[PDB]
Amino acid sequence: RLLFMLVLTVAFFVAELVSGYLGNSIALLSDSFNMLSDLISLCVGLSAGYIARRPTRGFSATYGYARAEVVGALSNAVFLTALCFTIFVEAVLRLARPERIDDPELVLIVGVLGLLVNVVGLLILHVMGDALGSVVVVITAIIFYVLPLKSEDPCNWQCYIDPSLTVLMVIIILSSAFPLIKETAAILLQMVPKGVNMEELMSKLSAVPGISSVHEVHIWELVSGKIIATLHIKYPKDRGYQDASTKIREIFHHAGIHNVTIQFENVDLLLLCNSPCISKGCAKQLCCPP
Amino acid sequence: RLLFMLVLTVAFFVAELVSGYLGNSIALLSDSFNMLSDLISLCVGLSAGYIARRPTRGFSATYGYARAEVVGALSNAVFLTALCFTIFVEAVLRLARPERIDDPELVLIVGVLGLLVNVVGLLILHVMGDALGSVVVVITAIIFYVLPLKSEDPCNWQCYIDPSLTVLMVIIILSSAFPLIKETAAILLQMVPKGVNMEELMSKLSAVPGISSVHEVHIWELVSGKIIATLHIKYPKDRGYQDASTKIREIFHHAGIHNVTIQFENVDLLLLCNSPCISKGCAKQLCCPP
Ligand SMILES: [Mn+2]
Ligand SMILES: [Mn+2]
Numbered sequence: 001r002l003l004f005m006l007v008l009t010v011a012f013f014v015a016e017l018v019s020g021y022l023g024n025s026i027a028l029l030s031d032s033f034n035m036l037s038d039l040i041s042l043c044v045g046l047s048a049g050y051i052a053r054r055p056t057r058g059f060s061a062t063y064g065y066a067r068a069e070v071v072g073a074l075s076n077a078v079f080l081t082a083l084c085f086t087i088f089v090e091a092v093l094r095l096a097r098p099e100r101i102d103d104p105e106l107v108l109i110v111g112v113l114g115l116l117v118n119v120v121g122l123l124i125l126h127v128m129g130d131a132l133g134s135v136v137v138v139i140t141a142i143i144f145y146v147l148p149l150k151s152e153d154p155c156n157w158q159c160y161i162d163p164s165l166t167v168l169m170v171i172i173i174l175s176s177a178f179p180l181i182k183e184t185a186a187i188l189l190q191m192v193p194k195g196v197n198m199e200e201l202m203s204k205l206s207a208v209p210g211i212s213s214v215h216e217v218h219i220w221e222l223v224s225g226k227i228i229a230t231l232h233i234k235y236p237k238d239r240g241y242q243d244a245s246t247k248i249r250e251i252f253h254h255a256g257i258h259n260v261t262i263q264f265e266n267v268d269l270l271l272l273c274n275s276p277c278i279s280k281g282c283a284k285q286l287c288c289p290p
Numbered sequence: 291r292l293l294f295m296l297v298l299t300v301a302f303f304v305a306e307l308v309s310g311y312l313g314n315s316i317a318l319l320s321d322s323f324n325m326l327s328d329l330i331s332l333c334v335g336l337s338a339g340y341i342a343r344r345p346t347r348g349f350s351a352t353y354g355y356a357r358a359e360v361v362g363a364l365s366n367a368v369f370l371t372a373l374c375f376t377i378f379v380e381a382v383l384r385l386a387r388p389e390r391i392d393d394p395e396l397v398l399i400v401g402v403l404g405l406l407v408n409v410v411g412l413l414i415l416h417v418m419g420d421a422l423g424s425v426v427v428v429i430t431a432i433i434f435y436v437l438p439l440k441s442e443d444p445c446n447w448q449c450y451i452d453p454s455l456t457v458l459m460v461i462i463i464l465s466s467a468f469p470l471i472k473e474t475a476a477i478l479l480q481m482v483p484k485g486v487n488m489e490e491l492m493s494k495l496s497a498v499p500g501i502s503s504v505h506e507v508h509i510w511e512l513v514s515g516k517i518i519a520t521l522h523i524k525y526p527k528d529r530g531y532q533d534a535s536t537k538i539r540e541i542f543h544h545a546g547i548h549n550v551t552i553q554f555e556n557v558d559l560l561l562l563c564n565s566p567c568i569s570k571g572c573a574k575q576l577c578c579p580p
Contacts, residue, residue: 082372
């Protein structure tokens with residue numbers, strides 16, 4: 001990996017913020033708010049590179065800090081969505097009251113210098129979609145320079161191109177952030193991973209010879225590949241559960257789940273958990289409550 | 291509960307946005323961005339009221355959707371932080387280039403009408419801290435009305451009060467959001483709950499008579515009160531684990547943990563998991579890897 005991007009990305013995010021406010025362009029602010037999310041993603045990816053190759057497994061994080069690439073990706077998409085909200089709000093108010101660009105050259109220079117950065121990125125969807133936002137800035141500046149507007153004249157159609165294309169860029173930016181908030185929140189909501197087929201898996205689980213009942217089947221995803229499947233299983237007292245255990249962990253293996261914890265409880269009052277909390281009053285605090 | 295707040299809060303968030311942009315006040319935009327987070331929190335709390343009293347426990351969410359009050363609270367604090375970032379950026383640029391208030395009356399009216407809403411809130415820290423942001427708006431409007439500034443004059447000291455107090459309000463707003471991002475991310479990072487004393491708990495766990503080894507001790511928090519504690523425990527083959535199990539689940543009960551799953555594995559090669567994935571190649575995909 002190479003990390004020599006924060007030096008460039010952070011430096012040009014500030015440049016596009018200053019030039020976006022000094023040059024009076026929402027497209028420049030939009031792109032700078034996109035490069036800020038790009039630097040947040042770079043920091044998250046670098047943090048996820050130091051969490052890996054150096055596990056911790058401490059007394060306060062029993063699973064480690066490997067979930068920081070999902071929390072840091074949902075916190076970056078929500079950050080970007082909130083930034084796009086303000087960009088959209090400032091883009092609708094400039095469609096009502098139009099304003100112009102004071103320095104097209106300062107917008108064009110930093111517009112290209114920042115489009116040339118997303119070409120020293122992937123070459124050597126957000127990264128793919130960050131380069132289109134840097135084309136809008138150079139398009140708007142060109143329209144204001146191959147067709148100038150003297151300070152003394154009123155706003156023409158040109159004052160509308162910048163807010164109109166910035167609204168389109170918010171729709172394009174939020175068309176990739178929206179699939180990311182839904183895909184990452186499902187992980188942090190303790191939902192079953194999308195790849196796992198919980199219908200076939202639970203149909204095969206009940207077909208294991210020697211198994212009498214299966215309850216508390218919790219399957220969730222820590223990170224990609226790491227799927228934890230808690231499971232309680234009742235079994236007749238006169239039969240061992242060794243071959244049953246082997247079958248259950250081989251069924252889960254074929255489903256891509258390798259972190260399987262099975263609690264074997266001995267054996268319609270024979271279908272509840274034999275081992276809830278030590279008191280009946282714990283039923284309020286039990287998950288999958290009885 | 292009462293839900294007759296979205297009708298008021300959503301209606302006045304739009305009013306404070308329009309009047310904050312039509313009246314040229316960052317404090318009004320700051321408060322409207324705070325009332326937007328307030329309505330997002332109201333929607334999250336109402337969703338968490340319908341997830342409760344009606345559990346689902348489906349085939350795609352084995353723990354239910356009870357984690358939506360933690361994901362929806364981290365997504366609301368990050369949303370608020372990103373909004374405060376834009377508010378702060380527009381507050382530093384107005385400290386450099388000062389602007390004034392076009393309609394102090396429109397700022398004062400909607401300033402009070404929106405301070406009277408946070409008095410029809412708690413009465414019948416963010417809610418406590420939303421009312422201070424509505425005092426800054428009424429303070430700034432008063433200074434511009436008990437001391438007017440004709441359009442023909444340059445900006446005096448009055449043009450600085452609004453950005454200066456909005457910077458202070460961002461610090462106050464982010465002084466309650468920051469403790470919320472750290473407290474909610476620890477839950478979504480699968481970290482040990484703060485209340486649980488993992489030192490005394492793990493010291494008592496190893497002192498249970500009949501237990502030979504304890505590994506894969508995963509304790510995490512779904513929501514407040516619901517703590518799930520996965521655990522693998524080795525034991526001698528000639529001794530049963532019934533009394534040991536009772537002791538272990540009574541030790542966890544005294545620690546506030548009632549969702550305990552124990553995998554009893556039979557018995558320094560006697561201290562590893564007896565039941566990893568069915569193949570040695572799964573060690574890469576195992577959590578707490580061997
Ligand atoms: Mn760009
Ligand atoms: Mn308020």
